[PDB]
Design a binder for this molecule. Structure first.
Ligand SMILES: [Mg+2]
Ligand SMILES: [Mg+2]
Ligand SMILES: [Mg+2]
Ligand SMILES: [Mg+2]
Ligand SMILES: [Mg+2]
Ligand SMILES: [Mg+2]
Ligand SMILES: [Mg+2]
Ligand SMILES: [Mg+2]
Ligand SMILES: [Mg+2]
Ligand SMILES: [Mg+2]
Ligand SMILES: [Mg+2]
Ligand SMILES: [Mg+2]
Ligand SMILES: [Mg+2]
Ligand SMILES: [Mg+2]
Ligand SMILES: [Mg+2]
Ligand SMILES: [Mg+2]
Ligand SMILES: [Mg+2]
Ligand SMILES: [Mg+2]
Ligand SMILES: [Mg+2]
Ligand SMILES: [Mg+2]
Ligand SMILES: [Mg+2]
Lengths: 259, 156, 207, 74, 60
RNA sequence: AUAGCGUAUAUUAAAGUUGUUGCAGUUAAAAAGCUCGUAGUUGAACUUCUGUUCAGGUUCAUUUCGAUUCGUCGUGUGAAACUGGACAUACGUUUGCGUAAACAUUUUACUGUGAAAAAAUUAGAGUGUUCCAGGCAGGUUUUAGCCCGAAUACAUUAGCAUGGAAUAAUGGAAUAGGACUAAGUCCAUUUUAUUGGUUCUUGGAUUUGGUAAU
RNA sequence: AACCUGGUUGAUCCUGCCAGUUACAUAUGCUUGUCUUAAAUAUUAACCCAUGCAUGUGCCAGUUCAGUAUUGAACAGCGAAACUGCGAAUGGCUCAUUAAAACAGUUAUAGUUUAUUUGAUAAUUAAAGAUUACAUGGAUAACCGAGCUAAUUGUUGGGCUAAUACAUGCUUAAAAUUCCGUGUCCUGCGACCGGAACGUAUUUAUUAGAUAUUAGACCAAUCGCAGCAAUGUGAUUGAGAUGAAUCAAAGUAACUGAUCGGAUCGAGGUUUACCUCGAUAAAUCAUCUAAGUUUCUGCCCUAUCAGCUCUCGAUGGUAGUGUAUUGGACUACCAUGGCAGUCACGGGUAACGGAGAAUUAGGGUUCGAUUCCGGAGAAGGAGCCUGAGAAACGGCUACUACAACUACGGUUCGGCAG
């Protein structure tokens, strides 16, 4: 197809952005970055659609080219309109001192979770690879594309580190075993939150894990979509308010409209 | 010990000439084997054979990745290669019944197996070895077929 | 304009297989480098000739047109030296390759003993080029540096083939590089089994 | 402050508010200029650029600043 | 021109173009509800029909 | 019929005039002159039946009742088909804390779940675009705000995961060392920081006694 | 809305079609007043095209002695030209080709490539030569000047000066490890002493890649370590990843020098010899992005297609070669295979495949050139340049068939399926 694709059409932009069908032809193609294209929430959508701080395209440009440095991701400045803010990222707006975390709700759209200052220092990281590096230095790699050196050696692959973004120092970690708390990054089970019942390894391809929530409904999903939220029943994150429990539309209609 | 070909045949990643081994006038003595970790037992013969097969999953660099097959061996006619046969019932929605279809997969046989025509083969997916062959033989199950191998239809 | 596409062949059944797209530049193959020994060629001024090749991804690949010297290893001894390659003796692929003196992987070549002869002499105090008066050891006994030269020599016994060859000063070695890619003839010296074999092959060709 | 307002609102709006001016006919000119420019070299090219019909970004920020200098706080 | 606005059909036309009983009922409707133009009654028919398909599927 | 309405042509229902559901074939068009027969399609009956006890719901009935109310709830009592315990020669061992594994259960078709799944479509919730087509918005003077939405279903085949007893195919001990067990013989063999002998384990083969309703 | 009616007879019950009825696409005829939307040279001719336009781009952060402005006496605001970057491979158009092909859903890449992004690394600037590091060297465009043509985004000579352009090169770890010395002591090729080599990468060869999801004892030698010393003393954490590696990360040889190891830029300043923010170039590994190949299964009509494939590849095996990589992709040798009534092979399609569309009691029937995703092509074939990506076509070369100028000798930024 003669090389790389530089455009994205509105119809094809992920449902998670909640763009208007009728709003145009194109949408903003997420930039190459920490997160994949489909797991991206770009900045331009973050500002224009979600916060409404930008009313149109020009506006976004204004915010991100203003010498004043308005927007922050994991502590580091970003001027790129299509920067792929992904899952677990902490995005902070210097002028208002708003600190949000990027998440999926149970319905699988992108949400900004308002965080107080103590939350906003911390960010959750999930182990992708673990290796010996050059010079015989152990290293570890993360979903947000971090490379962390000299990890605590007990840290296994597919764990969750709690990362201090002020100190760039991993604080506490927990791994994928029975009894820990998860959030589910991708699935039809996207956004649900729960205690791991157990894990079955099929060893040819795809390992499936099962989950429960506070209410006691089971889930299953492939290992890749599990993200660990801490030890115990306690999560190290403030969840958008479903608390991670899915609601039957019956439950929804009942509680909302009193049926 | 058998060398018949234009080129001398030895496994890769195994050095035959080490100072201890030159003291023995006998071919080889240190052999390469492997584990292909799908829970597949590495055969007795892979271990004790003299065979050079660069396409053997046990004796070589062959990586078995992602797809596994059960089948019938219809033809062991060619050099270190068989054909396998998978029979299935394709469902025709309208007439609301099935239809008997078959597929022939060329598989690669490592010399470590004894393969009678009309046996039962397990094969793992493989990198493209030849024009036809994407599959390599893992496990042979012996069995007796009466009459020609073709007519015999097993859906398992 | 050479092509590696599989589309230009018959599918398994024998059926003529259809074509919509063109030749694509990414299925490109490239002309062959017949890589030559300039060593014995008298008419040649330029003995070493290597071509950079701009490749997919902006990298380089290195074409050996003309080669004379290469880098060879002696396996038992773990000793690797660069020497001049003399002749291409046997080729399993095709014999017109031997006639054209072409270098390819698993070609069979001969090597100047000389660097290996010297390393051996240095290390074990034994000159392999000589028939009689084989031992070069120093005059002071009980001197750690001569003692070592004996202690080395104590365990060692060579193949008659390696010895005889060393005397001859030419050595049979099969070459392990891809000169049409790397731009090198790098190789290993034949020992034991492979030597029995390629000697016999050379021998029944010679018979 | 009307500083910000003067720095943020786009130009067609500053015309609605009478601050800026008319956007004159761009396209035709610009494309005939493109024509001639492509078809010669540097000296002549500069001589053509002197004649471009554009309302320059310079002139824009100039009228903006000047209007910011003619302003009186309520 | 690409456009993503949706298609509509508000009414339907009878298998049988002329049948007295039906025509008469339709003119009794046009009369009492002060309509013009038979399709008005047809689109009402359409609407009702939608409702009924719904109830039916739900009774499955 | 109506701001629309004729006509031509392809195609859809009409068509049970293409028929799996679902057609016809003595005489309306239609059984091949007749047998043998390979592919194909199709295939008789039998195997943990059954009974007894416990619990959980889910239904039912109503000369049991109740409470309140514009019909649900609680409760009876019995009666069902379950679902799951339990003992009965009876859907398994063995181990670590109702759930895993390993062992053992011949394979599959079939069926129930689940994962993986592209939006727009379609079905459909919410919402008065003046209705509506439709859009994904909206609603509120508590206003340097507030409230709420952008659901859900469907997503056929084949791959994947897992629960399955019927039905259907296929299997297993008929030249049996088949099964269990004991005692030998070989070939390998992880651990015991290392090579050697003995061993040990283990995991294959093999010889012979014993056990069994063979 | 799960409905049927007209026509064979003198009449009758049948079969059966014709006809009516219905929806929906194009077409068309007549007729047309508001408002809200709105398809649109697919079908025939992937036929041919005048003209205009559809691909350009500058920050404070690579080059300014243009110009402007009476500017920090090296420039400093604004801002051409022209080098140097980057893009031009997306987008838009069309459906001619195409029937396991493309496509769809499912896989593999342990068989690969990826410019721009995000994260992390980096002590050695090979040898010979050269060597200033308070920083190396030679050129050229714009410009000035002279020309050639009837002709174009043609270019020829001549005089100038920059670059992040084109060349070149300086930058003091320790330890350990390997080798060498006719060195000391010795007897362990062991210790001390002395001398080399020693980044990364490239190319081969060899040594080990550690395994605590796991079991031990009898002889010998145990190698070590407390310890000269007989005596022992055991041995138990120290090294990741996978289902699997010949993986990661390492040791020892050499090999290449065609890898990289900053002679570049801003800004704000503590009054200025020092701080604090940044821009950019580039290597490796991840990461994003996309691609190449790839597993399994699934297409319409046709037997007035029953056998097909294999003289140079048909199926497999070997060495090679080639490629980004896998492979008969290609070569040499070898074997005689591979597919087919479960329809091979071969025709046809007024056939691009899907997402979907019209009808629909149920089951079906019939369409999908056309918004989205794949695929293909740019008049027809082939071949290339350059790139991270191209067989590009709003790039070049050639032919076949054509388009535009011509002073006839030449020329075209000639290619509407934008
Ligand atoms: Mg961008
Ligand atoms: Mg995998
Ligand atoms: Mg590169
Ligand atoms: Mg403007
Ligand atoms: Mg008759
Ligand atoms: Mg039966
Ligand atoms: Mg029991
Ligand atoms: Mg008659
Ligand atoms: Mg009559
Ligand atoms: Mg009709
Ligand atoms: Mg009006
Ligand atoms: Mg410029
Ligand atoms: Mg065909
Ligand atoms: Mg296929
Ligand atoms: Mg000059
Ligand atoms: Mg020293
Ligand atoms: Mg300064
Ligand atoms: Mg079609
Ligand atoms: Mg398209
Ligand atoms: Mg694809
Ligand atoms: Mg046009």
């Amino acid at each position: 197809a003669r090389g790389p694709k530089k455009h994205l059409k509105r119809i094809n932009a992920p449902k998670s952005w909640m763009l208007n069908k009728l709003g145009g032809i194109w949408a903003t193609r997420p930039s190459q970055g920490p997160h994949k294209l489909r797991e991206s929430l770009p900045l331009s959508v973050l500002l224009k659609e979600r916060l409404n701080y930008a009313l149109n395209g020009r506006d976004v440009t204004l915010i991100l080219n203003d010498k004043e440095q308005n927007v922050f991701v994991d502590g580091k400045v970003r001027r790129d309109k299509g920067y792929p803010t992904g899952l677990m990222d902490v995005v902070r707006i210097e002028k208002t001192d708003q600190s949000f975390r990027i998440l999926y709700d149970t319905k699988g759209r992108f949400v900004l979770k308002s965080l107080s200052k103590e939350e906003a220092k911390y960010k959750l990281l999930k182990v992708t690879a673990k290796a010996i590096g050059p010079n015989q230095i152990p290293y570890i790699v993360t979903h947000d594309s971090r490379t962390i050196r000299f990890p605590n050696p007990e840290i296994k692959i597919g764990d969750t580190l709690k990362y201090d973004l002020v100190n760039n120092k991993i604080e506490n970690f927990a791994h994928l075993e029975s009894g820990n708390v998860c959030y589910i990054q991708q699935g039809n089970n996207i956004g649900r939150v729960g205690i791991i019942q157990h894990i079955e390894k099929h060893q040819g391809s795809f390992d499936i894990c099962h989950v429960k929530d506070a209410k006691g409904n089971a889930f299953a999903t492939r290992l890749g979509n599990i993200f660990v939220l801490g030890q115990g029943k306690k999560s190290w994150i403030e969840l958008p308010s479903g608390d991670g429990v899915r609601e039957t539309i019956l439950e929804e209609r009942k509680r909302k409209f009193s049926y | 010990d058998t060398q018949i070909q234009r080129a001398y045949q030895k496994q890769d990643g195994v050095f035959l000439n080490s100072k201890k081994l030159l003291a023995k006038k006998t071919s080889a003595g240190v052999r390469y084997y492997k584990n292909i970790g799908l829970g597949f037992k590495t055969p007795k013969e892979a271990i004790e054979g003299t065979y050079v097969d660069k396409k053997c999953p046990f004796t070589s660099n062959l990586s078995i990745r992602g797809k596994i097959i059960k089948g019938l061996v219809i033809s062991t006619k060619m050099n270190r290669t068989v054909i396998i046969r998978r029979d299935y019932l394709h469902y025709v929605r309208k007439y609301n019944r099935y239809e008997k279809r078959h597929r022939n997969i060329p598989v690669h046989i490592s010399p470590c197996f004894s393969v009678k025509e009309g046996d039962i083969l397990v094969a793992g997916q493989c990198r493209p070895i030849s024009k036809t062959v994407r599959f390599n033989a893992l496990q042979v199950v012996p069995n007796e077929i009466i009459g020609s191998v073709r007519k015999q239809f097993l859906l398992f | 304009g050479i092509s590696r596409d599989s589309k230009h062949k018959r599918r398994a059944t024998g059926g003529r297989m259809p074509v919509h797209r063109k030749k694509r530049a990414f299925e490109k193959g490239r002309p062959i480098s017949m890589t030559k020994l300039t060593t014995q060629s008298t008419t040649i001024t330029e003995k070493r000739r290597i071509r950079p090749v701009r490749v997919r991804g902006g990298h380089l690949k290195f074409r050996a047109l003309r080669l004379c010297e290469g880098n060879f290893s002696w396996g038992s001894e773990n000793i690797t030296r660069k020497t001049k390659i003399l002749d291409v003796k046997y080729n399993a692929t095709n014999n017109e390759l031997v006639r054209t003196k072409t270098l390819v992987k698993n070609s069979i070549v001969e090597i100047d003993s000389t660097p290996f002869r010297e390393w051996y002499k240095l290390h074990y105090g034994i000159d392999l080029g000589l028939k009689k008066d084989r031992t070069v050891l120093g005059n002071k006994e009980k001197s750690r540096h001569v003692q070592k030269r004996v202690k080395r020599t104590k365990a060692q016994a060579l193949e008659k083939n390696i010895e005889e060859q060393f005397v001859s000063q030419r050595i049979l070695a099969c070459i392990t590089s891809r000169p049409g890619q790397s731009g090198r003839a790098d190789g290993y010296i034949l020992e034991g089994k492979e030597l029995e074999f390629y000697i016999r092959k050379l021998q029944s060709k010679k018979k | 402050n009307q500083q910000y307002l003067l720095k943020y609102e786009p130009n067609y709006r500053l015309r609605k508010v009478k601050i800026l001016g008319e956007k004159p006919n761009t396209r035709r000119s610009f494309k005939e200029l493109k024509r001639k420019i492509k078809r010669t070299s540097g000296k002549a090219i500069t001589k053509l650029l002197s004649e471009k019909k554009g309302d320059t970004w310079a002139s824009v920020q100039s009228k903006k600043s000047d209007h910011l200098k003619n302003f009186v706080a309520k | 021109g690409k456009t993503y606005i949706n298609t509509s059909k508000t009414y339907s036309t009878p298998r049988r173009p002329y049948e007295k009983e039906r025509l008469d009922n339709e003119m009794k409707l046009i009369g009492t509800f002060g309509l013009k133009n038979k399709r008005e009654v047809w689109r009402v028919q359409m609407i009702l029909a939608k409702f009924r398909k719904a109830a039916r599927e739900l009774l499955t």
